[PDB]
């Protein structure tokens, strides 16, 4: 009887908690018409995505008690909210078909903690932090349900597995012969995981110091959504784990290693055609489009026209595209002009003829810093195929 369940180490009732979340779904209209998340529930029923975002500020403004319980015990509360959503989703629209149970992703709008101020008091609480991505691993497969088959008589059995431990059979129940059951790797059931590395952003640093870093693990749906160098806000569970002294021995060290278990992260038409047709039918459109380029430059109109013509180009034997050269004194605005036009075209590239440049004009082969296997690095000229390549100090 579900009403008897209470979370360990504390005194919170599970069934009451589920009911309170359902009341929130059935009541929270947008304070700025059915409830806001009920709109998304109606939409996701037809769109077919497997997840539902909820903003924590709506939970807090609806009820302080539920909010406190969520932040305190995310490991037990979040699966309860998952169950609540799925009950409503299938109580309504029962004929709809969906391959998976819906996930709920609570998220907090803004950073609550500096990654320099995380303390032992925070362990297993829901926190949110911000930073700059540095590196992303290859995708890692992960076991979910082991498949065992008897060597002697081909009988099969399946084992649901327990926080990383497999309950290996000792004897085949059909043929009563010990140590005869074998794990079949490619018949087992697997999941996806990825490891991401993140750094504090340069603005919030103490003066003259080097930056700190953390390790994030992302599962299933979220497993490939970010790339190096960009910046994000992340919400997750702050975990802590022991580590072994050597691969053979079973002793563990007395100082633990911590990581973030990711739950949510955020990055920081006929009407147009008719407008374009009317604008193109306007007189002196060539002058107007040229004039639109680089407003910081007040007089070089025919140069702007030449650049505009390069952006438009010919059409397809013979080379159909256009090449342009700018010459004169250093310190003139030409580099700014290159950087301006570089930012206007999707397949654009920018580099310098100097050896200090960030990416070379020449293709080359090197060893991967991760695997130390060979990788072919094509140059800027190749990457800008069917695009514009800006070159400085030519």
């Amino acid at each position: 009887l579900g009403q008897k369940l209470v979370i360990w180490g504390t005194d919170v009732n599970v069934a009451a908690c589920k009911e309170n979340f359902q009341r929130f779904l059935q009541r929270f209209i947008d304070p700025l018409t059915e409830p806001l998340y009920m709109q998304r529930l109606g939409e996701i029923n037809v769109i077919g995505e497997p997840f539902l975002n909820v903003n924590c500020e709506h939970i807090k403004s609806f009820d302080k008690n539920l909010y406190r319980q969520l932040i305190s015990y995310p490991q037990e509360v979040i699966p309860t909210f998952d169950m609540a959503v799925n009950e409503i989703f299938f109580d309504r629209y029962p004929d709809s078909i969906l391959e998976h149970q819906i996930q709920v992703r609570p998220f907090n709008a803004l950073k609550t903690k500096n990654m320099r101020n995380l303390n032992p008091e925070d362990i297993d609480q829901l926190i949110t932090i911000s930073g700059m991505v540095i590196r992303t691993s290859q995708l890692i497969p992960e076991m979910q349900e082991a498949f065992f088959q008897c060597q002697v008589c081909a009988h099969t059995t399946r084992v649901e597995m327990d926080r990383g431990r497999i309950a290996e059979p000792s004897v085949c129940g059909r043929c009563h012969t010990t140590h005869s059951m074998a794990l079949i790797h490619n018949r087992s059931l697997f999941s996806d995981k990825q490891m991401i590395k993140l750094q504090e952003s340069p603005e919030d640093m103490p003066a003259g110091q080097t930056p700190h870093t953390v390790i994030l693990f992302a599962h299933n749906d979220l497993v490939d959504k970010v790339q190096p160098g960009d910046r994000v806000n992340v919400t997750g569970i702050y975990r802590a784990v022991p580590i072994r002294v050597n691969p053979r021995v079973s002793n563990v060290k007395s100082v633990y290693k911590t990581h973030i278990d990711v739950i949510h992260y955020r990055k920081t038409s006929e009407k147009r055609v008719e407008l374009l047709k009317e604008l193109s039918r306007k007189p002196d459109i060539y002058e107007r489009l040229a004039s639109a380029l680089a407003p910081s430059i007040y007089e070089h109109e025919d140069i702007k026209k030449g650049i505009l013509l390069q952006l438009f180009g010919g059409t397809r034997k013979f080379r159909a595209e256009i090449n342009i050269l700018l010459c004169g004194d250093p310190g003139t605005s030409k580099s700014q002009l290159l950087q301006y036009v570089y930012n206007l075209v999707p397949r654009g590239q920018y580099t310098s003829g100097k050896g200090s440049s960030a990416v070379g004009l020449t293709a080359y082969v090197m060893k991967d810093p991760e695997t130390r296997q060979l990788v072919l690095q094509t140059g800027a000229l190749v990457l800008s195929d069917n695009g514009i390549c800006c070159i400085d100090e030519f």
Binding site: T10, I123, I134, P202, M205, G208, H212, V252, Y256, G331
Partner: protein
Amino acid sequence: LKDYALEKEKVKKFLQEFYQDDELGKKQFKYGNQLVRLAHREQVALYVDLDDVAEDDPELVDSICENARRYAKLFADAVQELLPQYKEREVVNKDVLDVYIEHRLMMEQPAELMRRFELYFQGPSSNKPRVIREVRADSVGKLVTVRGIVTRVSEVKPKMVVATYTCDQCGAETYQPIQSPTFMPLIMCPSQECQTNRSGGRLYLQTRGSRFIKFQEMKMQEHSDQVPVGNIPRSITVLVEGENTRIAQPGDHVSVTGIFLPILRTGLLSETYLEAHRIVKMDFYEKLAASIAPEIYGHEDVKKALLLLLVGGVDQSPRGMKIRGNINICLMGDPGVAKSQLLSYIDRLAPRSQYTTGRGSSGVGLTAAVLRTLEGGALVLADQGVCCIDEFDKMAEADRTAIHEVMEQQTISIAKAGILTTLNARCSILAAANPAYGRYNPRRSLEQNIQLPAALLSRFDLLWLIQDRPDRDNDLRLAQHITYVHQHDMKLMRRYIAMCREKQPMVPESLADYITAAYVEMRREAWASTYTSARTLLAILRLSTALARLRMVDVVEKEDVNEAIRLMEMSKDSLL
């Protein structure tokens, strides 16, 4: 050996009865008051002072100084036994870990799990600090005091103190206190019901119940002047734990009280470390212009240029069309000229600054570097301040590109392990350079004399040639001063620049029109007499706004533009 029960009662007597003639002689019994605060969970750590103990029992102090670890445990138990007597109040529930303890009490109705306080010794004033070389093996286990410089510090990590497990079958709980640097966890339930029935229930560890403490690792090194002739300096590892964390910083002088102990294995020779118990760290315009480098005769307006370099302009920041406020200047010196004195005076004067030389010496470079974490770099260590480069003309292409990147973006990049890490460099730059051969030649341009490339060399707001030559009276005056020196308020200045730099003065359209007329006339003369460009206009803006900041005024005025104009104009005269 002593009876530690008698010693416990003596310690209790000290805590119960000692008063330092405390609270302005009102005799309020400092440690009794502290025990009240501890009982009501107002405070965590308690620093017992051994000078107080010495008033009653110096033999106890001597007993503590050797084999300190016993007395650490003894005092902690005494405080735990006395704590309920100073309680009078019920404390509010405020911690998940204590919610588990509260549930444990509710279900029940070891002490290490409940003992939420820390106890540390403050060293007796008799004990002078040792150098890291004088802590020899006869001091193992004894209380010591050491002095040195910090080199490296880790982040704060959670250290395990007692583990808590739960049993799947019988519903009980078990505890395991931790003391060594490693341990081995439990597996299967030892309770009598599970054991007698051999039911095989397994144990699951609970991070919601177990106890953790803040832990941090640090290294400390000898002062260079304390090292004996012809030797390499040594270092010592210091372990910081509890309420002592986050005090120390890299490159900072500290004095540490602690216990010196050997490391546990997993030969008879073993490494050692220092267990920390306490860490202890070791008009206006003309007047301020005349206050810069008074040892040096002449160079009146150069001193004002350096003053405005320290004061700075304003970052305009119009919606990304950025103009930066940092002044940057360069000094060209004849061989052996007085510039070294002026440079070192500004280096000494400035509240946050750094120095380096362009030859690329055996030490760390202008940018950050890697060792086996990232560290260092003159461009990095000067951040909210000014950085000075000496013998700039001997720089390499790496140095030139680094300076170019700082001038554009005021940030740098160094690869730790192929990753593209990047790092703040927000400071202003001051450059000192010398001609390629001999004295500067007025018959040739400055590019021909100093021979840096014109692209970066023209970045500086001001350029000054420091040329000087013999004369009988001036040389005699200088010689008299030097021989006199050999024979025999900065706080106000810092406060003035602190308060005045709060201003960000704007310009009205009338001043913009005035500047337009002045600038076009100046450029007409420049081509008629070329070097003038947009950089010149931004330099005028920077120096005039900087002067407006030097005044306690919210806007620039005509006199500021005129002052900036005569300063940039007259700088050419130094080249001739």
